Amino acid sequence: SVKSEYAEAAAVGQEAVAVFNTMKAAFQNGDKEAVAQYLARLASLYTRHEELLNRILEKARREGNKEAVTLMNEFTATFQTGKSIFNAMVAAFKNGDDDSFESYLQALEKVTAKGETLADQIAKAL
Ligand SMILES: O=c1ccc2ccc(O)cc2o1
């Protein structure tokens, strides 16, 4: 159902959380090779997480679940902000700008957190 599809999206979000936390540690340690690999893995997880969210949103629209659609519209707007900042962080790493990278790392943590109270609401709505 849409709810098992939501359990998969939740699991991918958690896989990104885990990889992001190992990537931040590697950045702090100066292990640039490792960071470059984690960033590739995160970019993929964004691609897969987005695909699941798109499929959840479309099923809610077709099902007429107005409250789920509202909440999913809001969350995917937050998620998109995350994507834009993630691209900025990748571009900072490419450029060798650790100052900007550190900042973007902090910003992305706030986007994830600011969307969590919505993520919990959607499930109760689906
Ligand atoms: O799919 C995601 C969700 C959150 C997230 C947060 C940080 C990141 O680097 C990648 C991420 O991918």
Ligand 1 centroid from CA 65, angstroms: 26
120/115 Cα distance (integer angstroms): 9
- Resolution in angstroms comes to 1.4
- Among 53, 46, 35, which residue's Cα sits nearest to residue 82? 46
Angle, helices 2-29 vs 32-63, to 10°: value is 160
DSSP state of 19: H
Indicate the SS3 state at residue 77: helix
Torsion sign across C-alpha atoms 31, 36, 37, 39: positive
Task: For ligand 1, pick from 37, 49, 75, 105 the residue to mutate: most ligand atoms within 8 Å of CB.
Answer: 49
DSSP state of 64: T
Cβ atoms of 72 and 56 within 8 Å: the answer is yes
**Technique behind this structure?**
X-ray
DSSP state of 30: T
DSSP state of 96: T
- CB under 8 Å to 62, separation ≥6 — which residues? none
Task: For ligand 1, pick from 17, 23, 35, 42 the residue to mutate: most ligand atoms within 8 Å of CB.
Answer: 42
Ranges of each domain in the chain: 1-126
